């Protein structure tokens, strides 16, 4: 059943992918080069279905952080 959980957490988190893709571009200049890479790696990650729930929890924290560092509030 916790696979039906992972599937549902993933469907929900994907709502933030436009904001991650937008950050990577709108801050292309003031971002590290490897920071651009990982934001890209994270957006790809969210295309797959075989993500573990612990990975999903980290992404949840990663996305809270981005929302707070860029265009906050």
């Amino acid at each position: 059943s916790m696979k039906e959980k992972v599937k549902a957490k993933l469907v929900e988190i994907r709502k933030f992918v436009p904001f991650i893709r937008r950050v990577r571009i709108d801050f292309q200049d003031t971002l590290s080069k490897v920071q651009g890479h990982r934001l890209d790696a994270l957006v790809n990650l969210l295309d797959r279905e075989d993500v573990s729930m612990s990975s999903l929890n980290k992404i949840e924290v990663i996305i809270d952080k981005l929302r707070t560092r860029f265009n906050p509030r």
Binding site: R38, L42, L45, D50, S52, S55, I62, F70
Partner: peptide, 23 residues
């Protein structure tokens, strides 16, 4: 093998976790 894949995802995410994105 799923350990190798799970590990690659986690190492990558640990690198975004640790980055404060100091702005």
């Amino acid at each position: 093998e799923p350990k190798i894949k799970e590990d690659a995802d986690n190492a990558m995410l640990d690198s975004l976790l640790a980055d404060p994105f100091e702005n």
